[PDB]
Design a binder for this molecule. Structure first.
Ligand code: HEC
Length: 108
């Protein structure tokens, strides 16, 4: 309940100007440091054919979902690979919620 599907358009602007330095989803761009983020949702975690995971994400065999994403922002570390992310929380929690909905669009 902490996360509510707001508007993907609003988050798209936020993602477009604050998330292309890595995932670069661009609907079809190079994985770069982070995964395209266009297939994290689907079967278990870690399903990028090109980008590779530390394998830790695969061992957990967890499916990434909007609920799981809430735990990732609120608590992330031992649960998933020691992967380090340049993002360290967002001052605007409302804007962060919009980003979550936008990622769902990346999967489909
Ligand atoms: C490059 C330094 C990164 C930037 C900046 C962003 N992310 Fe990232 N992200 C990065 C890596 C190294 C990984 C892979 C870790 C793994 O094993 O999957 C990720 C992963 C995510 C995930 C899943 C959480 C996880 O499994 O660790 C999400 C949903 C995610 N990243 C979201 C996200 C958003 C909101 C960012 C821009 C707004 C963003 N990432 C930037 C590396 C980097």
């Amino acid at each position: 309940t902490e996360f509510k599907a707001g508007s993907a358009k609003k988050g798209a602007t936020l993602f477009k100007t604050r998330c292309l330095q890595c995932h670069t989803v661009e609907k079809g761009g190079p994985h770069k440091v982070g995964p395209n983020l266009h297939g994290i949702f689907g079967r278990h975690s870690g399903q990028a054919e090109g980008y590779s995971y530390t394998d830790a994400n695969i061992k957990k065999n967890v499916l990434w979902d909007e609920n799981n994403m809430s735990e990732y922002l609120t608590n992330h570390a031992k649960y998933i690979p020691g992967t380090k992310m340049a993002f360290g929380g967002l001052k605007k929690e409302k804007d962060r919620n919009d980003l979550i909905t936008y990622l769902k669009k990346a999967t489909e």
